[PDB]
């Protein structure tokens, strides 16, 4: 029952922030390709006192796309992921996944 309180605690601590870029991320349709996700997600990392880890998996897909998972060192922690044939596109996909994921926790 302590982890129900931990789920509620994580929901509250990621719905308690009042940053402008988080409000912009919730407002902006993140399916748009004009938004950088790597640089914006690094800015969000520097803003929200956690550290983004781009753990780049050495094992690619069976179809041949390089894989990389990101870690958002919050309390509790979060892990997102992405894939793509080059490192930049896969990291952009993983950052977009983590940014829409934060768009879930910034939804009120």
């Amino acid at each position: 029952t302590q982890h129900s309180n931990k789920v509620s605690q994580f929901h509250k601590t990621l719905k308690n922030a009042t940053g402008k870029k988080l409000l912009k991320l919730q407002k902006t349709c993140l399916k748009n390709n004009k938004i950088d996700y790597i640089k914006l997600l690094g800015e969000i990392a520097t803003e929200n006192q956690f550290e983004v880890t781009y753990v780049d998996i050495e094992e690619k897909t069976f179809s041949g796309q390089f894989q990389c998972l990101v870690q958002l060192s919050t309390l509790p922690v979060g892990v997102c992921h992405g894939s793509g044939p080059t490192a930049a596109d896969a990291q952009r996909h993983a950052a977009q996944n983590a940014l829409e994921y934060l768009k879930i926790m910034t939804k009120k």
């Binding site: 029952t1 982890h3 129900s4 931990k6 789920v7 994580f10 929901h11 753990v55 998996i57 050495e58 094992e59 690619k60 897909t61 069976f62 894989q67 998972l69 870690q71 509790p76 922690v77 979060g78 892990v79 997102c80 992921h81 894939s83 994921y101 879930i104 926790m105 939804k107």
Partner: protein, 1582 residues
């Protein structure tokens, strides 16, 4: 709130006993029990005819370990047992003749029969364990096919097959028909269905088996969003490549890389569970299951040290937080102001959940039982009903609870397993009293654990086994039973499943040995039960309890459930079916017999009546008639309990409370009188090394003066003894004077003044503050001084009395200086005199004997010291006095002893060194004050008129007049018993703990783990098909299933998306109706006696009757109705430690009053002795007195209420009453003897239980010198009725008075308490060959007789004593629980007076501990195991199988022996079995009466095998640290009840010590807190 008890584990055993039978059961414990006790029952016939009981299985021959079958058989089947090992050479010599039960393979028994050493005529019982396996079937195919049906049916041993519950098999039903038919054809037995399944099928109302279809799920935006993010997570997880050679890539971890687990398996299981819950139940249930999986996964993060597992589990927890966010936002999307979250669950729920809610709403007392196959579904379902009941006022009246199948492994996590088991017991407790009507179970609640009667069972999952389906069907036991199965295009599959399972019910329930009454037959019973009047023992009373035909079977069931029993003794009525053809009409007849625990052992015979249920109702009607005719059922028809039983009134008046009684009461809180001389002669002086004083030994016999006793009453002669002063051991004799002295008043006054001077100023044994008066009605004993005559005698020293009278105020006074100047010295004056000082202590002087005159010592001589040079200088410095004449020699003195008691019979001479030489507490102070050596000066000291030798004779009399005032009450008790009796004339340790734990854990292993393997094979196997072919009955399956299909679509099972003469004539179709009109007449009913008269006339008019046999009804009746079957179905020894040495009641002087006064002196005063030596045996007499008497007054009354009678008569309140009516209370001494305060020279508050502590001790007073028998007459003096009463008049026998005759009354009645009548044999003779059967039951008991050392004159009490409570075949006598009941008290005396009479002389605490260690059920169990009495006894109970199985696993791993209960000793004295303990005790009843009340015979027989271990307990006697802590504070240190703290996790235990305080200790559990409290008490006290 009650249930009708059915014959479970009774019809199975009866059908397994009568005909060749096949039993299919779930647990492997119950099948092995039924096989084991069937071997036990058939071994009675295997013993006489020289036959072999066999056990065929596949677990045999696997290892040299004793498998479960061998160890269970060598404990419980109290027989000779052998099991084949895989690699033995099979000795053919005597292993099949010297072993009752042999456990062989089918191949092993086949090859044994092939060698023709053992024949098929020489085997009695064949039992085939798990023969439904196809491998076992092919094993036993040649065994049957070549030997068994070629053998004649007269040469056939009885065949019982065991099978797994093959009904649960997932094959087609034509395969099941081929199974039943082929296995009946091969194994040659009827298949009796025989399980919990079929008793809950037959004997409970079969539910309407409902299918409820549910619609497929509709989706909304939240549902596709959740499914999309989880499908993305499965895309990543199945996309993720796992390889130990890629994550790590180390070649030196080749065996270690395999042990690293896959970090995707738990994500796959978790999100697959969430995916199927999204698919079938809904996003609400999925969010709850995701919350549960987060609660699991955050701990699963903590457990792992690997990195990739950690980031993947963090990713899964990330996904769970995502799902919680979407679902909580969507539920808060609809959570407006006043919006109903009930409807928010309603819209998002799947139609499966809403259809379950409709099933719940159709049930507006409820008992709902909902199953599932997964635990997390159970938890989320529980939370659905909780959130619904907290939001829906319609379902607000619903209380629900869930239970999971998560019994953890105890070898890894035992504490969490204990938590889950405690939680399980708690919720089963909260469910079984109907606090919460809705329970959600899992597969663990299908078998094993029972539930009460339910009215609705809902299966969420349609099961793959029939055992789960029909157990769910059976759990709805109440009459409105509804078996709802939910499904969500699967309607056709569920319809096929229902038709298949109802087909299994059809060919399983009808394939029985008992069957049901059909519904039209039930309606026939309804119209038939009104044809007879209600049997009433009180027909005049309108509101009397009545027995009709219909409720009679329920009353007989309740009477059979009401007999006293444990959890595993199970007693049921036994009715047997017989059809009789009469005038061409088939009229079934029902016989009925009660169990043996009820004394009605004879069969009760019904009459033939045309239907089954009416004949059963007549059997129950005549059974209730015979029940009230004997007296087991009262007028109110309630069967007799232990509390409600009342014995005969001549034994009930002792329980009446006293008027004072009716701390709680009764709880633990001039005449020539007799003259005698006291002659003292030294016989053993003090040794020279023991004489620390270094002085001359003074015997008392050199003294010219001694003492004499002058008594008005006659002094009886007593045994000689000695006195042990500082001088040594002195023999004491009481010399009788040859002449009688007259009395004079002035000499009486002088003698009384001498006594006052002796008791106040000489011996000081009459201390002050009290008064004295030398004229008492109670005795007139005087003590006189005498001087030895020159002729050799002793004459009264009247001159000494005159000197004492003239010197009554002798005190040390200041002698003047002129008188000391004029004082000379005489050595004869100071030869053997007593000196006191007058320079110091004038008010309280000290008295010293004269030891040595020293002419070399003088006042001019040197004082022993440098501060005082001379004695004169010492005196003039310390006291300022001048010694006048200093030329005289000094004086050596000897101090008096500081201890008054000197006898304590025959242990003071070695107790002189115990405490420092009479304990000398003033010696150290006076040697510090007066500088060690007490060399005195005779002119400055005074001389007493009392001589020093007479003083040494006078100090050995401590107890003088309080002794005489006390030792008349005991002689008065002696006079009363001699008046009413005839005898007597009227005028390391941690290593030990860890070894015990490892042996217990590794040796249990035949316990609930077998229940967990049953739980494993519950929903997994359902296997072992044999053969199926194209037979035409397959088409007989296909139509009927379709017919069953047309039931389900039409019976409401599938729910879519929406004249009294006429009944008397039919009552007796073979009886003419004009006779019935003659008997009826003005009346309106036919009585039972009318039916007896009609059947008696039919037997008279038609003398040839017939019988036929069917049913599950037992052949355990036999004899009374069967075996003969000749046309009757209408009506009925050294003298050491010798108990038996009763001395003669003619010519005996009777008891000495010293032993009675020992019974009157307690341990509270503790004046050398105590009552606890006698009462420790005395309490054990009362049972041995009362119970044996209660064996003879109520011979046909069972022990379950005689135990209540014994507990009422042996009770401490009862002995309080019995001691108070004799008014003994002023007779004990409960005050400390001390003359200042509580002695009157010529009261005591006494506790309740302490009065009892005298009274039982009183019979101990008559234990030895009176023997037992006249001791019985002492409770005839009490009124404890133990001996039979004969009422007579004055016989006038001048030879002697009758031993036990009382005083005559006003009607001159004379009561004689004669001998105990010898009991009748319990061998009832309803059959004319009960002696022949008793001879036919016990072949091998001569080995039992040579093992003990006793040969029985009669096997009647032995055969009863060898017979279980639930052993209904042994119908001749009762069970072994009536010879337990008196044998325990008889062996309790044998052990107790063995422990009391031995010359080691243990303490009262030591004797109590030796009793409580030497008497328990475990020690009789131990000597039962060790000396081979796992070889003779008979038994019939279910779980005794596994209990006593694991018991001899414990014993034989240890090697029988003792040490486990020798640890249980002080590990529990500071109950795994019962029966085999009391088995060894049960024979102690039989030899109590086979030897005709000879305790010496029993002890002599059992001594040769008891002697080394009672010697070992006589090596373990000398005291204990726990016994230390209980001799300091036995009652004072009391450990209080624990109290919970505010944290709710800690427990505090407070121990209170009186006059010291309360000490509290805290701890996590109760034992640690109690230990902390004990350590705090030890730290404050020690």
């Amino acid at each position: 709130t009650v249930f009708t008890p059915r014959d479970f584990q009774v019809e199975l055993l009866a059908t397994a006993y009568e005909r060749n039978t096949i039993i299919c059961l779930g647990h492997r414990s119950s099948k092995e029990f039924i096989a084991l006790k069937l071997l036990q029952e058939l071994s009675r016939r295997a013993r006489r005819h020289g036959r072999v009981s066999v056990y065929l299985s596949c677990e045999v021959g696997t290892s040299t370990e004793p498998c479960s079958i061998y160890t269970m058989l060598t404990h419980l089947t109290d027989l000779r047992v052998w099991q084949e090992q895989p690699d033995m050479q099979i000795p053919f010599d005597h292993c099949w003749t010297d072993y009752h039960v042999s456990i062989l393979r089918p191949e092993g028994f086949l090859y044994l029969l092939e060698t023709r050493e053992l024949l098929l005529s020489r085997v009695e019982l064949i039992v085939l364990e798990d023969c439904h396996d196809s491998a076992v079937y092919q094993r036993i195919r040649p065994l049957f096919e070549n030997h068994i049906m070629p053998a004649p049916p007269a040469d056939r041993p009885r065949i019982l097959g065991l099978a797994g519950p093959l009904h649960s098999a997932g094959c087609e039903l034509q395969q099941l028909s081929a199974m039943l038919a082929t296995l009946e054809q091969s194994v040659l037995c009827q298949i009796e269905s025989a399980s919990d399944i079929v008793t809950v099928l037959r004997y409970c109302s079969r539910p309407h088996e409902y299918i409820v279809q549910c619609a497929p799920f509709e989706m909304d935006e939240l549902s596709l969003v959740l499914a999309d993010v989880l499908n993305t997570h499965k895309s990543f997880l199945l996309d993720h490549r796992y390889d130990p050679y890629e994550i790590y890539g180390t070649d030196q971890f080749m065996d270690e890389l395999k042990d690293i687990p896959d970090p995707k398996v738990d994500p796959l299981n978790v999100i697959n569970s969430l995916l199927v819950v999204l698919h079938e139940m809904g996003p609400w249930c999925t969010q709850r299951a995701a919350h549960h999986f987060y609660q699991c996964n955050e701990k699963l993060k903590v457990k792992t040290p690997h990195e990739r597992h950690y980031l993947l589990y963090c990713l899964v927890s990330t996904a769970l937080i995502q799902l919680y966010s979407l679902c909580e936002h969507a539920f808060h999307r609809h959570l407006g102001s006043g919006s109903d979250s009930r409807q928010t669950i309603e819209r998002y729920s799947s139609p499966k959940v809403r259809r379950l809610l409709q099933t719940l709403r159709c049930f507006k007392t409820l008992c709902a039982l909902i199953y599932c196959n997964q635990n997390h579904t159970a938890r989320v379902l529980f939370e659905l009903l909780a959130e619904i009941s907290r939001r829906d006022p319609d379902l607000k009246f619903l209380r629900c609870q869930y239970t999971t199948d998560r019994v953890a492994d105890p070898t890894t996590e035992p504490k969490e397993a204990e938590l889950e088991h405690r939680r399980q017991e708690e919720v089963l407790k909260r469910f079984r009293m109907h606090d919460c009507n809705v329970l959600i179970g899992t597969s663990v609640l299908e078998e094993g654990i029972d539930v009460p009667k339910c009215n609705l069972v809902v299966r969420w999952d349609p099961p793959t086994t029939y055992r789960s389906y029909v157990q769910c069907k059976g759990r709805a036991r109440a009459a409105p039973a509804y078996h709802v199965i939910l499904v969500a295009s699967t309607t056709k599959d569920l319809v096929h499943q229902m038709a298949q399972y109802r087909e299994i019910e059809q060919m399983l329930l009808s394939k029985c040995a008992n069957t049901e009454p059909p519904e039209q037959e039930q309606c026939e019973a309804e119209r038939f039960s009104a044809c007879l009047a209600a049997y009433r023992p009180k027909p005049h009373l309108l509101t009397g309890a009545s027995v009709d035909l219909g409720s009679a079977i329920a009353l007989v069931n309740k009477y059979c459930a009401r007999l006293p029993s444990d959890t595993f003794t199970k007693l049921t009525a036994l009715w047997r079916c017989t059809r009789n053809e009469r005038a061409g009409v088939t009229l079934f007849q029902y016989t009925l017999r009660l169990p043996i625990n009820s004394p009605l052992k004879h069969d009760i015979v019904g009459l033939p009546m045309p239907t089954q249920t009416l004949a059963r109702r007549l059997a129950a009607l005549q059974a209730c008639v015979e029940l009230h005719r004997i007296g087991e059922l009262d007028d109110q028809l309630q069967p007799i309990g232990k509390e409600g039983f009342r014995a005969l009134e001549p034994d009930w008046e002792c329980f009446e409370l006293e008027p004072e009684d009716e701390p709680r009461p009764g709880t633990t809180k001039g005449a020539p009188c007799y003259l005698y001389f006291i002659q003292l002669t030294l016989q053993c002086p003090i040794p020279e090394e023991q004489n620390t004083r270094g002085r001359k030994i003074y015997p008392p016999e050199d003294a010219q003066q001694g003492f004499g006793i002058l008594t008005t009453k006659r002094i009886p002669k007593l045994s000689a003894f000695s006195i042990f002063t500082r001088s040594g051991e002195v023999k004491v004799s009481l010399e009788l004077a040859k002449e009688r002295v007259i009395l004079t008043s002035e000499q009486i006054v002088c003698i009384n003044g001498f006594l006052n001077y002796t008791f106040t100023n000489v011996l000081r044994l009459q201390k002050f503050l009290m008064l004295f008066d030398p004229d008492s009605t109670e005795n007139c004993v005087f003590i006189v001084p005498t001087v030895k005559a020159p002729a050799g005698g002793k004459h009264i020293d009247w001159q000494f009395l005159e000197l004492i009278q003239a010197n009554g105020n002798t005190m040390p006074r200041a002698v003047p200086d002129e008188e000391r100047q004029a004082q000379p010295f005489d050595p004869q004056r100071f030869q053997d005199a007593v000196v006191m000082p007058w320079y110091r202590n004038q008010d309280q002087p000290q008295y010293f004997y004269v030891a040595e005159i020293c002419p070399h010592l003088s006042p001019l001589s040197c004082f022993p010291g440098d501060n005082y040079r001379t004695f004169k200088h010492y005196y003039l410095v310390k006291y300022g006095l001048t010694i006048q004449n200093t030329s005289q020699p000094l004086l050596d003195v000897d101090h008096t002893s500081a201890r008054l008691n000197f006898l304590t019979p025959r242990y003071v001479n070695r107790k002189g060194v115990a405490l420092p030489t009479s304990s000398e507490e003033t010696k150290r102070a006076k040697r510090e004050n007066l500088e060690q050596k007490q060399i005195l000066v005779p002119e400055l000291c005074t001389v007493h008129p009392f001589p020093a030798s007479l003083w040494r004779t006078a100090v050995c009399l401590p107890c003088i007049l309080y002794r005489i005032n006390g030792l008349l009450l005991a002689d008065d008790i002696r006079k009363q018993v001699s008046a009413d009796l005839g005898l007597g004339r009227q005028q390391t340790a941690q290593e030990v703990e860890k070894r015990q734990k490892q042996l217990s854990i590794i040796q249990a292993t035949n316990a609930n783990e077998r229940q967990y393997q049953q739980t494993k094979n519950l929903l997994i196997g359902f296997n072992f098909k044999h053969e199926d072919q194209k037979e035409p009955a397959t088409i007989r399956y296909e139509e009927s299933i379709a017919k069953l299909k047309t039931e389900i679509e039409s019976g409401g099972m599938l729910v879519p998306h929406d004249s009294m003469m006429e009944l008397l004539k039919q009552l007796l179709p073979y009886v003419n109706e004009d006779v019935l009109a003659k008997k009826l007449g003005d009346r309106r009913e036919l009585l039972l006696s009318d039916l007896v008269e009609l059947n008696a006339d039919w037997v008279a008019r038609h003398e040839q009757e017939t019988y036929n046999v069917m049913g599950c009804g037992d052949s355990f009746d036999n004899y009374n109705d069967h075996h003969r079957l000749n046309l009757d179905e209408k009506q009925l020894l050294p003298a050491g430690f010798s108990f038996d040495r009763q001395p003669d009641l003619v010519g005996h002087p009777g008891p000495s009053p010293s032993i009675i006064l020992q019974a009157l002196t307690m341990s509270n005063a503790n004046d050398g002795i105590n009552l606890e030596r006698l009462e420790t045996i005395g309490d054990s007499f009362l049972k041995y007195a009362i119970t044996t008497y209660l064996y003879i007054t109520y011979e046909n009354v069972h022990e379950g209420k005689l135990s209540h009678l014994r507990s009422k008569q042996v009770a401490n309140l009862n002995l309080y009453r019995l001691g108070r009516r004799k008014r003994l209370g002023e007779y004990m001494i409960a005050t400390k003897f001390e003359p200042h305060d509580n002695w009157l020279p010529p009261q005591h508050s006494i506790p309740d239980k302490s009065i009892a502590d005298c009274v039982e001790a009183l019979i101990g007073a008559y234990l030895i010198e009176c023997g037992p028998r006249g001791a019985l007459l002492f409770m005839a003096w009490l009124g404890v009725r133990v001996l039979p009463i004969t009422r007579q008049l004055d016989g006038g026998n001048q030879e002697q008075r009758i031993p036990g005759s009382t005083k005559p009354n006003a009607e001159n009645v004379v009561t004689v308490y004669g001998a105990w009548p010898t009991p009748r044999s319990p061998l009832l003779h309803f059959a004319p060959n009960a002696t022949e059967e008793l001879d036919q039951l016990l072949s091998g008991f001569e080995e039992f007789e040579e093992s003990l050392g006793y040969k029985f004159r009669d096997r009647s009490y032995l055969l009863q004593a060898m017979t279980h409570a639930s052993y209904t075949p042994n119908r001749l006598t009762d069970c072994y629980q009536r010879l337990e009941f008196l044998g325990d008290a008889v062996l309790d005396y044998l052990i107790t007076r063995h422990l009391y009479e031995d010359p080691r002389q243990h303490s009262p605490g030591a004797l109590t501990d030796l009793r409580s260690a030497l008497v328990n059920n475990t020690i009789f169990a131990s000597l039962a195991v060790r000396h081979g009495f796992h070889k003779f006894f008979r038994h019939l109970s279910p779980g005794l199988n596994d209990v006593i199985d694991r018991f001899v696993r414990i014993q034989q791993e240890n090697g029988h022996c003792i040490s486990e209960e020798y640890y249980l000793l002080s590990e529990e004295e500071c109950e795994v079995p019962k029966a085999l303990g009391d088995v060894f005790e049960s024979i102690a009843g039989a030899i109590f009466l086979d030897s005709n009340m000879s305790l010496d015979v029993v002890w002599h027989v059992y001594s040769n095998m008891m002697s080394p271990e009672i010697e070992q307990f006589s090596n373990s006697v000398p005291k204990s640290p726990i016994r230390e802590l209980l001799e300091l504070e036995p009652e004072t240190a009391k450990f209080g009840k624990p109290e919970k703290l505010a944290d709710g996790r800690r427990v505090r235990v407070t121990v209170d010590v009186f006059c010291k305080g309360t000490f509290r200790g805290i701890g996590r559990n109760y034992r640690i807190a109690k230990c902390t409290a004990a350590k705090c008490a030890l730290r404050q006290l020690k």
